[PDB]
């Protein structure tokens, strides 16, 4: 359980008599055991926003099965003109990613990884791309079972 | 799935 935030956003509702600033925040809840979720909540002060985002992210928790500590294939994460390349890292080389991106990688409990950024990388875009990538992955045992092969490589 | 448990 880590419950790591990404960034606080400020907006304003265009209404005369006081432009309402009910600004939104986004938090990510994980446990480094495959459980991943994230929630965005709009509120007025810090504690209410923090609590609403915690509820939203923790209630939306869903687990993703963990392979060996690093991914075994390269994959592209595409969301809102923002792509991120994931490449396998041998279990002794190291993990290279950005701060929030590294937080996302750790939140899944995955070890050393290789990453690369493409496009405009506004943090919500990167979060969506990472979500897509972790949901678009294919498994070796799956292709081995749905097919007829014993090697399972 | 055809089980509930």
């Amino acid at each position: 359980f880590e419950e790591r935030i990404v960034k606080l956003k400020r907006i304003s509702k265009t209404t005369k008599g006081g432009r309402n600033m009910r600004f939104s925040v986004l938090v990510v809840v994980g446990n480094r055991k495959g459980k991943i979720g994230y929630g965005i909540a709009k509120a007025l002060e810090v504690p209410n926003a923090i609590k609403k985002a915690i509820k939203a992210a923790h209630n939306s928790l869903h687990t993703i099965e963990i392979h060996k500590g690093s991914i075994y294939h390269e994959v592209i994460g595409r969301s809102g003109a923002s792509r991120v390349l994931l490449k396998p890292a041998p279990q002794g080389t190291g993990i290279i990613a950005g701060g929030a991106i590294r937080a996302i990688i750790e939140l899944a409990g995955y070890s050393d990884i290789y990453t690369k950024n493409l496009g405009r990388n506004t943090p919500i875009n990167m979060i969506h791309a990472t979500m897509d990538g972790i949901l678009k992955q294919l498994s070796p045992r799956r292709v081995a079972i749905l097919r007829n092969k014993n090697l399972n490589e | 799935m055809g089980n509930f448990d």
Binding site: - | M1, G2, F4, D5
Partner: protein, 240 residues
Amino acid sequence: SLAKLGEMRTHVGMVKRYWNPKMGFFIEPERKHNNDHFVLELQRQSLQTAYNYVKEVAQNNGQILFVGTKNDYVKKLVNNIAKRVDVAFITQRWLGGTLTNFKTLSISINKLNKLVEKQAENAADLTKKENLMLSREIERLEKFFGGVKSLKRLPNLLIVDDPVYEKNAVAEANILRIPVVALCNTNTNPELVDFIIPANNHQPQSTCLLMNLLADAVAEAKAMPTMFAYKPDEEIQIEI
């Protein structure tokens, strides 16, 4: 016996051009007349599978939900089965969101139990106007939440008369992991339904038989007397 041609007094006749192309593949290779027809044998086996699965589920001591909200036909059938079998049911229209949002259901039914227990306990505790208002709230609760006040937890199984026509029900069922059965129509999506039961519901002469057979299933599963689903005759139920 069980779901043969003798019991089937109507299996086709659904109004045309309201259909799903992939529901033209699971059932009834396309008719030249383009009238919405349905298959006999595949529906029979699907119904048998639903019957045995709901039997097993009831033997697991689980909760079940039954639905009916049509003008009078399906509503009358579901009311008859509700006073016959203790299952969750809604006599009136779905509130848009009544399954996905669950905490609001819990608070509504807690207030419903408060009102019911107050009315039962009350010998002289409110004025005439106050009692009239409380009875108005009681009646409003009976309209929608009254059919589900009997059970106070999520029903583990549920039927749908028409998932596309009950879009809210099918959406809220797909929100959850609960298995669902549905009288699938030619303009439905089989992937939205856990167990396919392709049958005509817009023709009431078939949906009445389906409702009776599900009533038989739940009654026999609940160790209660059963009226049909193994019988060489069935009563006529036609619109007048």
